Amino acid sequence: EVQLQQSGAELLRPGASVKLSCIVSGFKIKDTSMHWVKQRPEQGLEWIGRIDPANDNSEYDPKFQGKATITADTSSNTAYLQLSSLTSEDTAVYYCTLSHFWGQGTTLTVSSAKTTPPSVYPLAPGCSSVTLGCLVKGYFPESVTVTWNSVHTFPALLQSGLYTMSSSVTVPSSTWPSQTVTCSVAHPASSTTVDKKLE
Amino acid sequence: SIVMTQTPKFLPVSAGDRVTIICKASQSVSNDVVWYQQKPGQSPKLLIYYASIRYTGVPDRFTGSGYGTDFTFTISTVQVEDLAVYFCQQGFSSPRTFGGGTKLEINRADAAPTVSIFPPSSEQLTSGGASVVCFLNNFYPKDINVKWKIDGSERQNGVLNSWTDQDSKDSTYSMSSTLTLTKDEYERHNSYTCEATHKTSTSPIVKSFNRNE
Amino acid sequence: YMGNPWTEYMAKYDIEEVHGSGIRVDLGEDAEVAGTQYRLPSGKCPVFGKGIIIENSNTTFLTPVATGNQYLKDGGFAFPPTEPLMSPMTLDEMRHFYKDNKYVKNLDELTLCSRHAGNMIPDNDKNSNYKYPAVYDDKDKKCHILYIAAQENNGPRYCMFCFRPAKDISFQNYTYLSKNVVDNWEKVCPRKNLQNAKFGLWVDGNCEDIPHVNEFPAIDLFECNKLVFELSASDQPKQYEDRYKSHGKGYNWGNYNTETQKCEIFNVKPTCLINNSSYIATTALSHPIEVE
């Protein structure tokens, strides 16, 4: 079986550098060019460059020369993107491709802001369908998962330093609080899980 | 550097309409043009390569044509599943430049928002802050006005709005309006009102609470 | 006497030399995957019209192997639909996939399909010289990589999958391709059958009859090519279940008399043609239908 696996999400400060990996299993890459594509938050796709793993012949968009370095190794069937002089402009998803097949992307966040555990505040109405929610404040970097064990997830806004997001749920008023519902908030960077029971 | 000018940037369509996207190459790129579909949160997937050849598994509604500079992408009849951003790319010369993209909006019937207001939680005022959050769920179209009232006044400062992408199921929008202020400001005032104006109604949808109760 | 003017023309019919493995069953090399020895196809020529009949089944062998909750018997022999999807892949998808490789992008469709299958790494074992075979379909222009490289399981003892290689009418646009299929098979390997031609041996400035021939009825050329295929070089005997490698030795050739409807089959390499207007010259490798 053929698989494409990109390295994990990276949080880095400005002025630094990063090596992203793209591991192909079950397939010899030498015959196939391998491309890296950049996509900034809510923006378009940008071709960084590609490598011919046979010659190690790599080319670039002139915009990325001296910022992007694309390498490949046919004995490990792996491609790499090295990014120099990191900058908020470099905050993006980075896709690797095995020819015309695309990876799942690697999220890069470039910021001097440090990793912060989220605090969660329950949203209950004041004293047929009933709407509840959780307000997720004071977390960094971007990436919070919220599940309820009707459902809306509202994009995070950069609230003067940290991130502020929210989620809502709409359940029958006969099902609450007859059988109480909970929101669980996962933040993988801080490695924290928090369960808040609505009352 | 070959520029690929993709038109239009934004395209609203009803489920069943024809979608026509055009991509103009600044130099000759022969037949080497691919078309991609990127649905929300996913990797782009290839639909058409060499300008006109449909990839296996790609629905017959999707078609591409053109040679030289003038390339066109057609969805014969757009369906609900087709909600995505679409890109041309040329592969004939390096850099292999993408078009700027075309983001589709699924056009549908008008729907009034379900507004709900929420008091700042007690375990947030212990932290030293108070955020009044208001959800406006399941509305269309996207044009919505939200005005906050504090004891009947007009609150502009400390308001942050957040829209969602069109829903995967019902093609509706949802947004949260949050009034962020200090627990000292919140304790001083009593009435907090969430007022929502939409084109579906002339009188705005009002949803408020008193801190007194 | 005359020197042989058929020499260059007849080179592609030296199946022992140009193909060098079994035809009906091709398992002429061994290779290890993860500490385990396997037999695999190693023939240098495409086998036109060959596929696998699964016995007691309606499912075609080009169907992906059973995976997930599927039982072995409901699937076929092909690579399963995982992503990125390497099989099945059309000619143009393959050309596009390899577009930045000057050699590979310019290969003919059969060699391209064979090289594409050869890029699959079995169990991701880079120590392995094992490479999967493939079947190319002319109608759809599809390369199907085969996960199952076995070609025959015909043991009456329990005849799990029971199956045999065949040139079925529904396989006419198929070509069976081992990892070893050569770049220049068009110059060096058989394809179309030869009208107005009968294989013979060059003896004293003349093309003489093949001295030893077995004769069977065949209503048309396709039936004759099938019979030759059934008797051809084979790296396992029928109904079984090293000296088991044929190296392309077998009953690989047939002279078809279109008028008496006789298929004349032999196991010695031909060195000339007799021009007899009743005859078509066929090979186990050759297309079952096409004539030149």
Author numbering:
A (entry chain H): 1 to 127, 133 to 154, 161 to 210
B (entry chain L): 1 to 213
C (entry chain A): 105 to 263, 273 to 354, 388 to 438
Show me the paper's own sentences about this structure.
Seven loops extend from the PAN scaffold and surround a long hydrophobic trough, which we have speculated is a ligand-binding pocket.
1F9 has a very large footprint on AMA1, which includes hydrophobic trough residues as well as residues from the surrounding loops. For example, E197 forms hydrogen bonds with T56 in the light chain CDR2, H200 forms hydrogen bonds with H100 in the heavy chain CDR3, and D204 forms a salt bridge with R96 in the light chain CDR3. Loops If and II were largely invisible in AMA1-1F9 crystal form 2, but where main-chain density was observed, the loop trajectories differed by 4–8 Å. In contrast, within loop Ie, residue 225 interacts with 1F9 in a consistent manner, whereas the remainder of the loop adopts a different conformation in the two crystal forms.
